[PDB]
């Protein structure tokens, strides 16, 4: 498993992890007000 | 310019004008372009040296 | 024609002579006040021509010679 | 008939020569660099346009250009 | 019908010329342009630092693009 | 003007932004660029350069009006 | 170890994965700029590259195949999974007339859950078109807990699939005399794989289905049904239903087979409950082609002197042994085929491509008019889904054999293998093969488009007697209105006795209407049809001409000699002899990519106006058939203007007045694809010097930030901006269809 | 520290000289009083083709060299990188085409 | 405003209630300018300007930390780096990622922020 950390820090698998964790704000804009408008907060 | 001289290319239809390259090797056969510089940056080609004249050359590091 | 009502009448462009239609394509571009097939004209020219004194058809018949032989003169 | 120029920047490396699909190109003697040899073009009615020359040239700039010309029946590459 | 085919034949006629503009700007620096006539002038100054000018012109496009079509998405 | 207004002004401006991007890169890259440096010396209208260097298709500055007409008209 | 024939290195590491381009020599460089980053996927399954022996290509393909079943094992765990917890099977099973099939809910985030529609029964969710409520309903499925058995089953199958991969590469991999053993290959696959196949089918509906679905017409509810193993137990119960079962397995060995003409029915039609065929026909038809395939199974020699060898069979169809007008093959025919088909993958693939897409299109012809599964042909989203999509994959599948009949061209092509036999001497006269697929299509063209385009023309004018329509000049298509008669003829009580009912009701015969909603009715054949028919044909054949033709000069031509010194895939030879752009093989497959999607777009068009204007609509009390569109297509689809008015813009008003409904996701996925569309169309008018010459002023803007990157960025590469352009104008111009056919067919049912 | 021996038939000798990991065998040839062709020094062309009699180079900066002629033995010798030592021949682009 | 907006009140009183249009139709009706098809219309104002930061000013500084941490991971820094992200350099430009706006003011004025005209490659 030395260089399966190595592949899991590739471009690829980066990429994935990062867009599902940017993209989590699901629980964000469903926690509080799923409509939320420029003056509204 | 000799071995080792980090040098800014002169030449405006080369494609690293304005950078830096080392000096590989200089040719004492008295031809046109004797200097060899190679580039840490690969041209389109997908090469990365070439020879140079002295005159379009610049020195930005001397050999240590 | 159309100078007397310029709101309700639609201006004409030419004639339509294409031996191919229908009597039913004849009839279509033919309106009310027309005895042939012909192309309503969308370029303006009528409102042009209306607003700088054109009023009759010798009018447009003097201009159109008088463009023929300044053609000829370029 | 296409236009080819060899350039002093050639070094003799006879690639853009065995690139040629149709002997437009071939090497004589110089002393201008340290193969002793350059690139010539006397075949240049044959020269099709292909720039397989040009592919094969390691300087840069290229030290061989096609300027494609007047174009005739042998750089169209025609068979009728 | 007439004020819309006028303005719309006037703005198509204008984009066309628009881009012949810069066609035959491009063939007068192909074909006329002197770089020693015009050595360190305005001309040779913008042909200079033209990187600058088209890098600028692409955060434009993309700054302009990315929140219109956004916008309109959302 | 209304809220329907500000964003196809901001589509117009992307429109001819985008226009004078291809246009102005064309006519300025015309002379030649890093790609292909002596490109003033093939003309203004050429195919390409092969498919050396990667490839170099609509590499003239002919092709930035080409691709601008499309923007153009879009 | 049983067959001696394993033995495989490539032990399983670890290390060998955080280093990409390890299978490309030059891959496992050093990036450099980022089209090593196109590259890695552009050839990352050629196993034809990496290596050089056949033995080592022929294993990664053997595991490659085991990895690709346990992902079809896996979807196919997922799809009994939604219909076994995401459904309301239960409901359609109870009223499957009524209730809408779904099999996938929204969860409640932004917006979101309005796509959640009322499917009846209290149900909340997306009305699914794939048909498998129907299949599950045919199979023998009554509740979800069976749903979620056969899931479980293909989780473990799929778990099974990926370590028979591990197991045949990284413990004991084949030998290549295994994989060249095409006689037991086929012997098996024709005996086992299908003859086996279809007869425990026919033993599972002969014990499973077809109680099921008798006591489901019968009228019974679906819980209170006995479960599929009392129908095996106990033969009185099955006896009830059967009468033939009382008998049990005796008239079969002493031969008195009609003893079993109960649930062996020959009756060839649909069933008027359902909507589908014939339960009992359709085992009976398992049965016979389960005995046909094993039979089948028995003809190739193997290890027992009895068969036949391919390889003889292959050398002597030649002249002088081949029929007196077939004998211009000439004296070697088939002789170096048979080492072309067990030494290149390339031509295997080819034809096995070739065949998969032809059967796929054979499987969309044949279930919109022999419905197969009980209550299809009336849930007409459905059917026009499964029509739409089968028609795509084989589309798809055939350009696919052209590509890779080119790359066994350039790359596996031996001259001194195969000389003067058949692939020989058409190499060695495709000129004549291309111009006269030039010639007729061609022909075609102009009696296919520009007759729509002289009716137009005449419909515009004013003159309708002047058209090609069934009131003016008519072209009735008479060979297959006569072939719709001798069907018709056939099946009555003739040339086929046994059967009652046309083996469609598309031929002839009657019209069978199920809740109302018609199943299936005779489908009429005028002018439009032989219009149609002949756009169809003029598809078809310039999609042949664009693939043959790079297949045919893949090697060489007239202007380029040495194109295989090219390769498959590259862009150009430069701009000389003209300019030779897209002369690679390859770029003649992105140009039959385009020509597919147009050939498979209007054959899915014909489908959807046709059925929906002379089959499909609501029967009365009476028996008047009210068609959906109304019985237009007879005399709108014979112009362009009404394929664009009574098609295209008329039934598009169900998916852009969706908005704020439940089908406004495929409002949205209709505006999506058109932007894909769009989209695609800057890779394929553009060319890649613009790209490289525009980026020089983007690195130079970077390079003045000092946000300088090691990988140099470079644009996409020519034949990478074709199949981006190509893959981006397809996936937009098939989601827009798609959105447009389901929204349609999901609001006026 | 790496020992790379150059074999040449029209010279009919083998001088070893030792060249260090990160450094072009052609580059440390010419620090070392031996004469080699070379036209390009970037790996597109064949003028130092060096076929391989034993050991191992690390050429990944060379752009000509096929796939099956790579296998042959033939490296570059002016965009090599010497691992160990072994030895190479000298003047081989007769033998590539 | 939108309280007191007479055509703002026939999108209130019918539609569906759910958790999107409930907790939504409020704190947006309270402070938000609606015109006259019952819409609100993003203004721009006195009053805006301390509505229009917190989208303006706090997406800035988001953006200038992607922006700055795609630079300082990159500046030291080769060509493996950008394929497999080092995660400790990643982590080691985040916390320097975080007050990227002080240090891109302690870059300018160094004159570290921007190459010269002799030392970036140039086109013809
Ligand atoms: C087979 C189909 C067909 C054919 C052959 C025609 C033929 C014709 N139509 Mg017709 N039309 C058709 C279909 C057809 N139509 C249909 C289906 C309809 C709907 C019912 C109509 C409705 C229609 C109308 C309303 C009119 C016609 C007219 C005409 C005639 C015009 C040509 C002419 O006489 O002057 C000769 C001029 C030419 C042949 C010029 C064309 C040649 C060049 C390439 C174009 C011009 C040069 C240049 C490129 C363009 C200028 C610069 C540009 C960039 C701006 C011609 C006989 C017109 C007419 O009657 O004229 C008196 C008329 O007004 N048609
Ligand atoms: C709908 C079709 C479409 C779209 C979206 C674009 C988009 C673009 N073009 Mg293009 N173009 C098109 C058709 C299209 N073009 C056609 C048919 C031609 C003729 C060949 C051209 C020729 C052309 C040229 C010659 C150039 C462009 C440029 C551009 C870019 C600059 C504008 C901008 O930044 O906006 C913002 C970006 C977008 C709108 C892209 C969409 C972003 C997606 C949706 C993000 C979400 C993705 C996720 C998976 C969901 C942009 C990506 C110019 C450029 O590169 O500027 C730097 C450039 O010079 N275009
Ligand atoms: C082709 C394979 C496939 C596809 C396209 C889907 C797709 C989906 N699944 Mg599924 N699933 C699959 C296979 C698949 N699954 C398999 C093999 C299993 C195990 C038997 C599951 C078990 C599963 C569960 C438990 C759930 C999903 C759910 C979902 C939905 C949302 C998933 C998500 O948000 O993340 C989505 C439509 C979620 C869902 O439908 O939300 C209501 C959810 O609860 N899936
Ligand atoms: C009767 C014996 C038998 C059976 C049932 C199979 C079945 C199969 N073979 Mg095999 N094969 C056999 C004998 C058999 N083979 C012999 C004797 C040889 C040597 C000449 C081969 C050489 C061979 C090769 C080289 C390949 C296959 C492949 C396949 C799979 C084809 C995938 C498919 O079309 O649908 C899929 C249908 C699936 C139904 C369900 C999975 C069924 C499992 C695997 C076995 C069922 C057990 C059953 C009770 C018996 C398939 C499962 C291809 C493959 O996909 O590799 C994995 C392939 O690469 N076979
Ligand atoms: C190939 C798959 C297959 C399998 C696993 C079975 C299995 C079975 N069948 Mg059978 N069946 C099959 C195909 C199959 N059948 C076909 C193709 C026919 C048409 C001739 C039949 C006609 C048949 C009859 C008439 C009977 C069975 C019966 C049976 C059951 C035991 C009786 C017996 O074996 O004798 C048994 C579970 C007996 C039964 O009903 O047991 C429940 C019974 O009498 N079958
Ligand atoms: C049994 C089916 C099958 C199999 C095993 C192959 C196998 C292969 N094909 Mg192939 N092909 C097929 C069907 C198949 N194809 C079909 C149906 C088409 C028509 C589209 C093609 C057209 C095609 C071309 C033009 C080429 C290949 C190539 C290849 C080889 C390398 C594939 C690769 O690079 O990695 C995998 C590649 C990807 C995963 C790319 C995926 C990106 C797609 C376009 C987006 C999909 C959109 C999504 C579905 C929504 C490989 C041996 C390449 C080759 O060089 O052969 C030696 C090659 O140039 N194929
Ligand atoms: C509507 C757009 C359109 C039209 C009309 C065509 C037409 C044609 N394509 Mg094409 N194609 C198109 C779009 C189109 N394509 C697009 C969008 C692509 C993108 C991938 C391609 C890619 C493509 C390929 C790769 C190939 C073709 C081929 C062909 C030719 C087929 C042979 C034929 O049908 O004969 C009949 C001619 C027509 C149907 C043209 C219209 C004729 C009208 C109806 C009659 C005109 C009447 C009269 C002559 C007018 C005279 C008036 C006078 C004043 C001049 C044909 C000329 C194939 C070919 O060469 O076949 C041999 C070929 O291989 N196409
Ligand atoms: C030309 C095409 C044609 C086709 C496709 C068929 C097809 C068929 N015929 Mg048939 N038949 C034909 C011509 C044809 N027939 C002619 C010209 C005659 C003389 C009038 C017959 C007289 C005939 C008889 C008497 C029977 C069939 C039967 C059958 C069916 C059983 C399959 C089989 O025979 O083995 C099958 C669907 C059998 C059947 O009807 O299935 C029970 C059967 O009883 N045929
Ligand atoms: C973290 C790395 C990084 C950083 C700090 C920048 C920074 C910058 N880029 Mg950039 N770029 C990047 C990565 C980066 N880029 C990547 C990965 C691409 C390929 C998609 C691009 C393609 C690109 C183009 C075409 C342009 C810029 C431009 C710019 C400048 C201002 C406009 C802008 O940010 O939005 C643009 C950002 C994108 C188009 C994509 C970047 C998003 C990634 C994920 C971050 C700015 C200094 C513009 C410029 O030249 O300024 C005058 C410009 O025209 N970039
Ligand atoms: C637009 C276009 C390009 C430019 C397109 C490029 C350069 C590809 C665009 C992909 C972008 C650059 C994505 C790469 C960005 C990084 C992967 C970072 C993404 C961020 C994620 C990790 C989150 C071509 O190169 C081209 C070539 C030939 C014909 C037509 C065209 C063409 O139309
Ligand atoms: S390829 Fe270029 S450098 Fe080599 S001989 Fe030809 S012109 Fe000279
Ligand atoms: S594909 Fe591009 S590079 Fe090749 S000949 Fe055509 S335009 Fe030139
Ligand atoms: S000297 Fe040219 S590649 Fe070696
Ligand atoms: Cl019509």
Same mark, same amino acid.
């Given at each position: 498993m030395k260089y399966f950390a190595k592949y899991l820090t590739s471009a690829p698998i980066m990429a994935t992890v990062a867009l599902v964790s940017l993209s989590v704000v699901l629980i964000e804009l469903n926690h509080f007000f799923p409509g939320l408008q420029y003056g509204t907060y | 310019v000799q071995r080792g001289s980090k040098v800014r290319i002169?030449?405006?239809?080369?494609?690293?004008?304005?950078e830096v390259g080392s000096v590989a090797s200089v040719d004492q056969?008295?031809?046109?372009?004797?200097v060899v510089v190679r580039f840490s940056k690969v041209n389109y080609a997908g090469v990365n040296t070439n020879n140079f004249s002295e005159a379009e050359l610049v020195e930005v590091e001397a050999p240590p | 024609a159309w100078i007397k009502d310029p709101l309700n009448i639609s201006p004409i462009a030419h004639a339509i002579?294409?031996?191919?239609?229908?009597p039913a394509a004849m009839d279509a571009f033919?309106?009310?006040?027309?005895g042939n097939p012909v192309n309503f004209c969308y370029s303006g020219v009528y409102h042009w021509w209306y607003t700088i004194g054109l009023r009759t058809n010798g009018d447009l018949f003097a201009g159109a010679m008088f463009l023929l032989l300044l053609a000829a003169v370029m | 008939s296409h236009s080819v120029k060899i350039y002093?920047?050639?070094? &003799?490396?006879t690639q853009c020569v065995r690139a040629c699909p149709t002997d437009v190109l071939e090497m004589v003697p110089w002393?201008?660099?340290?193969? &002793?040899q350059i690139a010539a073009s006397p075949?240049?009615?044959?020269?099709? &346009?292909?720039?397989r020359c040009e592919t094969a040239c390691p300087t840069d700039f290229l030290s061989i250009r096609v300027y494609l010309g007047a174009e005739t029946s042998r750089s169209m590459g025609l068979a009728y | 019908t007439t004020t819309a085919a006028l303005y719309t034949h006037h703005q198509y006629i204008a984009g066309f010329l628009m881009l012949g503009a810069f066609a035959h700007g491009g063939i007068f620096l192909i074909r006329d342009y002197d770089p020693v006539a015009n050595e360190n002038n305005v001309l040779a100054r913008v042909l200079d630092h033209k990187e600058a000018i088209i890098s600028h012109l692409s955060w434009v496009s993309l700054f302009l693009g990315f929140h219109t079509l956004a916008l309109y998405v959302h | 003007i209304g809220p329907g207004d500000f964003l196809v002004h901001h589509a117009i401006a992307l429109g001819l932004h985008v226009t004078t991007l291809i246009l102005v890169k064309g006519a300025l890259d015309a002379r030649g660029?890093?790609?292909?440096?002596?490109?003033? @010396?093939?003309?203004?209208?050429?195919?390409? @350069? !092969?498919? !050396?260097?990667?490839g170099t298709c @609509?590499?003239?500055?002919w092709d930035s009006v080409y691709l601008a007409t499309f923007w153009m008209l879009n | 170890a049983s067959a001696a024939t394993e033995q495989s290195?490539?032990?399983?590491?670890?290390?060998? *994965?955080?280093?990409? #381009? +390890?299978?490309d020599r030059t891959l496992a460089?050093? /990036?450099?700029?980022?089209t090593w980053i196109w590259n890695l996927h552009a050839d990352? +399954?050629?196993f034809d590259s990496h290596t050089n022996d056949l033995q080592d290509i022929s294993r990664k393909i053997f595991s490659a195949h085991f990895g690709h079943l346990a992902v079809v094992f896996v979807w196919l765990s997922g799809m009994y999974f939604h219909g076994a917890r995401f459904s309301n099977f239960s409901s359609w099973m109870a009223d499957p007339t009524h209730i809408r099939p779904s099999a996938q809910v929204v969860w409640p985030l932004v917006g979101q859950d309005?796509?959640? #529609?009322?499917?009846?029964?209290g149900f909340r969710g997306i009305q699914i078109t794939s048909g498998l409520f129907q299949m599950w309903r045919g199979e023998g499925f009554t509740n979800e807990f069976q749903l979620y058995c056969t899931a479980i089953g293909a989780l473990v199958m799929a778990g099974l699939m990926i370590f028979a991969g591990w197991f045949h590469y990284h413990v004991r991999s084949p030998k290549l005399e295994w994989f060249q053993n095409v006689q037991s290959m086929l012997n098996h696959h024709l005996a086992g794989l299908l003859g086996l196949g279809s007869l425990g089918w026919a033993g599972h509906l002969i014990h499973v289905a077809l109680p099921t679905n008798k006591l489901l017409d019968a009228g019974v509810a679906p819980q209170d049904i006995p479960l599929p193993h009392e129908f095996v137990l106990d033969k009185a119960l099955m006896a009830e239903l059967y009468? $033939?079962?009382?008998?049990?397995?005796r008239p079969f060995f002493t031969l008195? *087979?009609?003893?079993? $003409?109960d649930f062996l029915?020959?009756?060839?039609?649909?069933?008027?409950?359902?909507?589908?065929?014939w339960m009992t026909d359709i085992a009976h038809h398992h049965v016979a082609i389960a005995v046909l395939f094993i039979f089948a199974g028995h003809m190739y020699r193997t290890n027992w002197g009895i068969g036949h060898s391919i390889r003889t069979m292959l050398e002597d169809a030649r002249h002088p042994k081949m029929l007196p007008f077939l004998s211009?093959?000439?004296?070697?025919? +088939?002789?170096?085929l048979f080492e072309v088909l067990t030494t290149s993958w390339h031509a295997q693939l080819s034809i096995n491509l070739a065949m998969m897409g032809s059967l796929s299109i054979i499987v969309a012809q044949h279930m919109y008019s022999? /419905? /197969?599964?009980?209550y299809l042909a009336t849930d007409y989203g459905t059917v026009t889904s499964l029509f739409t999509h089968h028609m795509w994959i084989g589309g798809f599948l055939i350009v696919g054999a052209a590509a890779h009949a080119g790359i066994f061209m350039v790359r596996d092509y031996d001259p001194a293998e195969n000389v003067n036999n058949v692939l020989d001497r058409v190499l060695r006269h495709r000129d004549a093969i291309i111009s006269h697929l030039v010639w007729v299509c061609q022909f075609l063209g102009f009696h296919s488009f520009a007759m729509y385009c002289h009716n137009d023309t005449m419909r515009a004018f004013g003159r309708?007697?002047?058209?090609?329509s069934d009131t003016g000049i008519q072209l009735q298509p008479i060979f297959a209105q006569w072939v719709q008669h001798i069907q018709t003829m056939?099946?009555?009580?003739?040339?086929?006795?046994?059967?009652?009912? /046309?083996?469609?009701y598309a031929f002839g015969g009657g019209l069978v209407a199920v809740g109302g909603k018609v199943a299936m009715m005779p489908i009429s054949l005028g002018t439009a049809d032989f219009l149609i028919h002949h756009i169809h044909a003029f598809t078809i054949h310039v999609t042949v001409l664009v693939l043959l033709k790079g297949v045919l000069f893949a090697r060489n031509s007239?202007?380029?000699?040495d194109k295989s010194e090219l390769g498959?895939?590259?862009?150009?030879?430069?701009?000389?002899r003209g300019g030779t752009c897209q002369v690679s093989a390859w770029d003649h497959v992105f140009l039959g990519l385009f020509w597919m999607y147009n050939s498979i777009a209007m054959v899915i068009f014909h489908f959807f106006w046709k059925m929906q204007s002379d089959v499909w609509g609501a029967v009365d009390a009476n028996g008047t058939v009210s068609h959906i569109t109304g019985g237009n297509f007879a005399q709108s689809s014979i112009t362009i203007n009404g394929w664009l008015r009574d098609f295209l813009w008329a039934q598009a008003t169900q998916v852009i007045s $969706?908005? #704020?409904?439940?089908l406004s996701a495929y409002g949205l996925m209709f505006l999506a694809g058109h932007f894909v569309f769009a989209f695609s169309l800057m890779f394929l008018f553009s060319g890649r010097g613009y790209w490289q010459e525009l980026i020089e002023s983007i690195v130079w803007a970077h390079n003045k930030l000092r946000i300088?990157?090691?990988?140099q960025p470079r644009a996409l590469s020519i034949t990478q901006g074709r199949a981006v352009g190509a893959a981006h104008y397809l996936l937009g111009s098939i989601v827009t269809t798609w959105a447009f056919f389901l929204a349609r067919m999901a609001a006026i049912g | 520290s790496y020992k790379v021996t150059l074999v040449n038939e029209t010279e009919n000798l083998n001088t070893t000289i030792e060249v260090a990991d990160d450094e072009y065998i052609l580059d440390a040839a010419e620090e070392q009083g031996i004469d080699l062709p070379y036209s390009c020094?970037?790996?597109?062309?064949?003028?130092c083709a060096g076929k391989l009699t034993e050991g191992t180079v690390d050429?990944?900066?060379?752009?000509?060299?096929?796939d099956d002629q790579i296998e042959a033995?033939?490296?570059l010798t002016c965009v090599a990188?010497?691992?160990?030592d072994c030895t190479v021949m000298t003047h081989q682009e007769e033998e590539l085409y | 405003p939108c309280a007191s907006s007479p055509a703002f009140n026939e999108r209130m009183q019918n539609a569906?209630?759910?958790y999107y249009f409930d907790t939504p139709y409020q704190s947006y009706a309270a402070n938000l300018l609606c015109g006259a098809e019952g819409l609100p219309h993003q203004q721009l104002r006195f009053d805006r300007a301390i509505d229009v930061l917190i989208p303006f000013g706090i997406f800035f500084y988001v953006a200038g930390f992607i922006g700055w941490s795609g630079r300082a991971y990159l500046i030291s820094?080769?060509?493996?780096t950008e394929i497999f992200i080092d995660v400790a350099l990643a982590i080691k430009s985040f916390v320097q990622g975080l007050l990227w706006p002080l240090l891109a003011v302690k870059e300018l004025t160094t004159g570290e922020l921007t190459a010269p005209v002799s030392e970036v490659s140039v086109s013809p």
């Open positions: - | 002169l030449r405006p239809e080369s494609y690293w004008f304005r056969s008295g031809i046109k372009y004797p | 002579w294409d031996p191919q239609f229908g033919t309106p009310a006040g027309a | 002093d920047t050639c070094i &003799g490396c002393d201008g660099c340290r193969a &002793g075949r240049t009615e044959d020269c099709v &346009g292909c720039k | - | 660029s890093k790609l292909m440096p002596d490109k003033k @010396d093939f003309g203004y209208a050429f195919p390409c @350069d !092969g498919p !050396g260097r990667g @609509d590499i003239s500055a | 290195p490539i032990p399983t590491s670890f290390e060998r *994965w955080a280093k990409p #381009g +390890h299978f460089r050093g /990036p450099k700029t980022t990352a +399954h050629d309005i796509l959640n #529609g009322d499917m009846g029964g009468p $033939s079962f009382a008998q049990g397995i008195n *087979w009609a003893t079993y $003409s029915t020959f009756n060839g039609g649909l069933n008027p409950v359902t909507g589908g065929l211009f093959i000439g004296p070697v025919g +088939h002789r170096g022999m /419905p /197969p599964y009980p309708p007697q002047d058209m090609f056939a099946v009555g009580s003739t040339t086929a006795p046994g059967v009652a009912s /046309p083996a469609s007239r202007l380029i000699p498959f895939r590259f862009p150009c030879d430069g701009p000389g $969706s908005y #704020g409904s439940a300088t990157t090691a990988i | 020094r970037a790996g597109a062309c064949s003028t050429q990944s900066d060379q752009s000509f060299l096929d033995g033939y490296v990188y010497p691992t160990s | 569906p209630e759910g820094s080769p060509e493996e």
